[PDB]
């Protein structure tokens with residue numbers, strides 16, 4: 001089997017991407033945020049505290065003839081920014097782009113943090129990291145991809161995120177028309193539950209490539225590119241007037257600036273992030289200070305190749321017995 005679904009930016013900055021997901025029978029379509037940095041499929045639901053729902057589409061398990069309470073199971077996830085959601089668990093039929101999994105754990109939110117309530121376009125997250133990170137207790141549950149894997153033509157999914165435009169998540173096949181050149185594959189460590197890999201270096205604009213190992217994760221659920229402070233300082237030093245602002249929470253730059261590209265290495269290959277992809281717009285409406293798309297990871301504990309980096313590439317998440325990541329230009 002295969003599946004193919006379009007993923008659409010939630011706003012004009014590409015802060016996140018939503019993909020329609022069919023849950024239950026008859027289908028209830030929710031727009032979920034496919035997250036390769038986490039491993040829970042959770043949704044706003046008829047069980048979510050009413051004051052914490054503000055415009056999201058909800059899953060109502062009592063209206064699905066295939067929903068079944070997973071007795072005794074609860075979940076609770078804290079994200080890296082401090083956001084959180086928790087609740088109970090149903091199993092139900094879940095389909096993405098024509099690919100159907102029966103018995104998928106659908107984690108129904110009873111509580112969500114304000115950051116989620118405020119995002120009316122996101123109806124939940126569909127985790128695509130390794131199932132070892134799934135938070136369901138007392139019986140950990142598998143991700144949608146893990147459940148689908150054996151049925152897929154090939155045990156892979158691909159992320160092809162658009163810049164200011166829709167893109168595609170495919171399951172079970174490589175679309176060889178979706179990228180240019182060849183795909184360069186690189187090793188993955190699953191020891192932390194992430195799609196963790198080592199970039200071979202970077203360049204700023206037309207500058208020379210610096211060969212240096214940068215361990216990080218491929219994370220579709222994070223917006224920005226978080227890299228070591230040395231790398232990030234080298235990037236922003238090429239933007240006149242750019243500076244790190246403790247009050248704003250990162251590097252900012254004059255909105256009148258033209259930003260240089262940023263290149264990262266994948267083995268001997270190179271992925272170029274155009275300068276425009278690094279502009280996240282005014283820090284507040286009407287400001288002439290703009291927020292940068294490359295930020296320091298120093299306070300995180302891990303480097304994160306988020307959407308800023310991934311949308312410059314066609315990315316293969318190869319879930320074979322020994323997983324690997326593939327990157328191609330496009």
Ligand SMILES: CN1CCCc2cc(CN)ccc21
Nearest residue numbers: 033079083115116119221222
């Ligand atoms: C608060 N917020 C809502 C928008 C989508 C989303 C995704 C993640 C996963 N990195 C964390 C928070 C969050």
